[PDB]
Amino acid sequence: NAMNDIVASTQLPNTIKTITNDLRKLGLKKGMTVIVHSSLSSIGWISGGAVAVVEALMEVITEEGTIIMPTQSSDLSDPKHWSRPPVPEEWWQIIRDNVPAFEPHITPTRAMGKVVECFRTYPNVVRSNHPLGSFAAWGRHAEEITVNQSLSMSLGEESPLRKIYDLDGYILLIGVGYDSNTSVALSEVRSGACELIKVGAPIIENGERVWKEFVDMDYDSDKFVEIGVEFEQKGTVTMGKIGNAKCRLMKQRDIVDFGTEWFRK
Amino acid sequence: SNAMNDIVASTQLPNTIKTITNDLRKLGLKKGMTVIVHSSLSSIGWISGGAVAVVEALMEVITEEGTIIMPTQSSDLSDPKHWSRPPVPEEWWQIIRDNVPAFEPHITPTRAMGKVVECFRTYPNVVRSNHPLGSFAAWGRHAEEITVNQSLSMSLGEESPLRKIYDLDGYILLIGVGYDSNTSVALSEVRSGACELIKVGAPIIENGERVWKEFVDMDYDSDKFVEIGVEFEQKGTVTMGKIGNAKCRLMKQRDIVDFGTEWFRK
Numbered sequence: 001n002a003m004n005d006i007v008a009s010t011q012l013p014n015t016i017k018t019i020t021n022d023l024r025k026l027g028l029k030k031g032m033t034v035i036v037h038s039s040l041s042s043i044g045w046i047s048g049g050a051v052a053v054v055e056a057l058m059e060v061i062t063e064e065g066t067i068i069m070p071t072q073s074s075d076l077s078d079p080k081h082w083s084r085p086p087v088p089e090e091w092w093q094i095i096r097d098n099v100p101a102f103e104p105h106i107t108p109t110r111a112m113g114k115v116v117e118c119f120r121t122y123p124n125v126v127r128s129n130h131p132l133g134s135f136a137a138w139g140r141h142a143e144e145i146t147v148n149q150s151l152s153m154s155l156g157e158e159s160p161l162r163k164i165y166d167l168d169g170y171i172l173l174i175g176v177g178y179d180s181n182t183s184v185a186l187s188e189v190r191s192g193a194c195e196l197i198k199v200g201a202p203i204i205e206n207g208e209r210v211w212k213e214f215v216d217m218d219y220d221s222d223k224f225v226e227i228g229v230e231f232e233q234k235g236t237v238t239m240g241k242i243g244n245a246k247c248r249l250m251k252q253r254d255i256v257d258f259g260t261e262w263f264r265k
Numbered sequence: 266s267n268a269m270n271d272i273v274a275s276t277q278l279p280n281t282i283k284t285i286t287n288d289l290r291k292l293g294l295k296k297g298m299t300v301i302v303h304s305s306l307s308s309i310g311w312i313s314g315g316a317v318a319v320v321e322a323l324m325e326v327i328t329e330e331g332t333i334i335m336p337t338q339s340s341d342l343s344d345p346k347h348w349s350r351p352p353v354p355e356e357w358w359q360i361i362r363d364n365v366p367a368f369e370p371h372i373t374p375t376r377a378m379g380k381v382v383e384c385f386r387t388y389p390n391v392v393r394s395n396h397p398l399g400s401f402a403a404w405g406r407h408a409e410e411i412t413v414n415q416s417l418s419m420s421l422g423e424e425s426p427l428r429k430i431y432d433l434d435g436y437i438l439l440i441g442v443g444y445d446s447n448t449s450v451a452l453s454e455v456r457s458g459a460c461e462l463i464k465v466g467a468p469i470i471e472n473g474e475r476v477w478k479e480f481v482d483m484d485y486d487s488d489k490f491v492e493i494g495v496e497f498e499q500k501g502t503v504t505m506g507k508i509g510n511a512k513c514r515l516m517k518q519r520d521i522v523d524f525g526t527e528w529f530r531k
């Protein structure tokens with residue numbers, strides 16, 4: 001059983017205070033702009049679960065900083081492309097006609113984790129407009145980062161990823177690897193190394209639910225591992241533990257710029 | 266199975282807000298009703314929109330002139346001395362009482378309530394009662410009346426949302442779950458004096474700060490609910506129907522609560 005093993009692998013309980021302290025040790029600082037990706041279970045047993053992680057991040061960064069997390073809702077997309085899992089083709093139009101429109105305060109994430117689910121409904125946390133590829137933010141640049149994401153190229157030059165690059169932010173990975181590192185999508189975009197697809201999603205326009213068509217890049221996270229590996233040789237990724245979780249902290253601009261180059265080749 | 270491919274394979278055609286709404290109506294849900302809902306999402310079959318769809322479907326049928334209630338329990342705020350699923354080492358217990366974050370209604374997640382409750386409790390105009398372990402959330406006409414002034418001690422007793430639903434002659438809707446999820450029966454247990462009092466603890470915000478607070482509650486036993494529910498069905502009034510693959514029950518809270526009270530008295 002999952003929980004039983006999480007407990008048996010923990011020597012002392014992780015708390016808001018021990019996470020805060022592990023975060024500072026790693027090098028998270030007041031006033032930093034940081035995009036966070038995490039696995040709650042990798043930390044080991046935490047008193048207060050996802051709430052403890054979110055409250056600890058906030059205590060360290062404070063309102064002078066900014067915390068961003070991906071809040072993707074890929075269950076709203078066109079089912080023609082579904083693979084985990086696929087549905088019968090005869091359902092496809094029914095889904096396009098009936099799936100509820102994206103509402104930022106309401107639509108759940110998928111595959112982002114409990115930390116993200118706690119974050120996005122936490123008070124004062126703001127979420128971008130995109131029906132499949134939204135981000136949530138909290139703190140000083142929250143509103144600047146999440147406003148006006150374009151429908152097409154959700155992870156591109158007019159997305160929260162670009163605004164983080166411009167603010168010279170950090171990426172914090174907590175018990176996950178480079179394949180969760182969203183920001184490298186920007187490298188794929190700038191090098192033009194991924195394929196394009198025609199997607200759709202339901203939005204609320206003029207007060208009415210419209211199924212909308214647009215273009216996005218077919219982001220493949222699997223080549224991100226390779227990039228991460230080579231990036232780590234060449235310089236600066238601070239590594240440390242938060243509880244049992246292996247974490248990394250790096251500058252987004254450095255990794256994005258390395259990834260762009262890596263793709264030209 | 267909760268594997269998504271098993272959930273898709275168990276379904277002929279997608280469940281949608283529309284199909285669920287129609288299924289709810291056939292079962293007897295009506296406009297203006299007061300209803301407390303307990304659910305399992307996976308039991309319905311594959312739903313376009315998931316929990317969002319189920320919530321919107323409930324709200325469509327009940328409307329703002331009715332009232333929807335769901336339990337929003339947060340049992341991992343409890344004293345770890347009693348935990349069994351799983352227990353934690355005894356050396357962790359005072360660390361936990363000193364560090365576990367205080368209950369705050371707009372923030373504290375539920376546990377074992379289900380995705381539908383986690384979706385519901387985040388909607389706008391949903392009000393949550395003030396109890397660090399046994400809170401309830403409500404939406405619609407009587408939402409405020411039902412959630413206000415929950416007492417700390419005897420959380421599911423006479424000063425609880427369960428009694429307010431009782432006084433309103435409300436309904437209970439089970440979607441793909443059995444009687445051990447039927448919280449209303451705890452009110453029967455209170456009224457019969459058929460369980461022990463225990464000393465319980467939780468973290469609350471009192472006087473602007475986190476306090477590990479102790480209080481008295483009953484040690485509610487949901488294993489007796491299943492046995493009550495088997496009997497109630499041989500003898501009381503319950504409507505049964507299906508929402509997708511889910512077997513559902515709709516019943517009057519006053520009926521099962523009174524039946525349960527008598528049952529406890531033998």
Ligand SMILES: CC(=O)SCCNC(=O)CCNC(=O)[C@H](O)C(C)(C)COP(=O)(O)OP(=O)(O)OC[C@H]1O[C@@H](n2cnc3c(N)ncnc32)[C@H](O)[C@@H]1OP(=O)(O)O
Binds near residue numbers: 036039042045176182
């Ligand atoms: C490139 C892209 O854009 S991809 C999008 C980016 N994705 C992300 O940033 C997400 C990154 N995270 C990951 O990828 C992670 O591996 C995940 C989220 C996919 C899965 O990680 P998990 O540890 O299994 O899940 P999660 O973080 O949600 O935590 C849930 C688990 O925590 C465990 N848990 C529950 N309570 C506690 C507690 N108090 N303490 C510790 N663990 C707990 C439980 O096992 C729970 O399991 P459940 O799913 O059965 O309820």
Ligand SMILES: CC(=O)SCCNC(=O)CCNC(=O)[C@H](O)C(C)(C)COP(=O)(O)OP(=O)(O)OC[C@H]1O[C@@H](n2cnc3c(N)ncnc32)[C@H](O)[C@@H]1OP(=O)(O)O
Binds near residue numbers: 378447487
């Ligand atoms: C007496 C008392 O007070 S007890 C407190 C009251 N308790 C309650 O009211 C709880 C009632 N519900 C239960 O008892 C249920 O059995 C639960 C919630 C414990 C478990 O039921 P589940 O169906 O497994 O969970 P839930 O309702 O959260 O739905 C999540 C599952 O839906 C499935 N799912 C995901 N998307 C969809 C979709 N679009 N369509 C259908 N199913 C989906 C997945 O299997 C997901 O499981 P996963 O998180 O393991 O991957």
Ligand SMILES: [Mg+2]
Binds near residue numbers: 371387388389
């Ligand atoms: Mg809210």
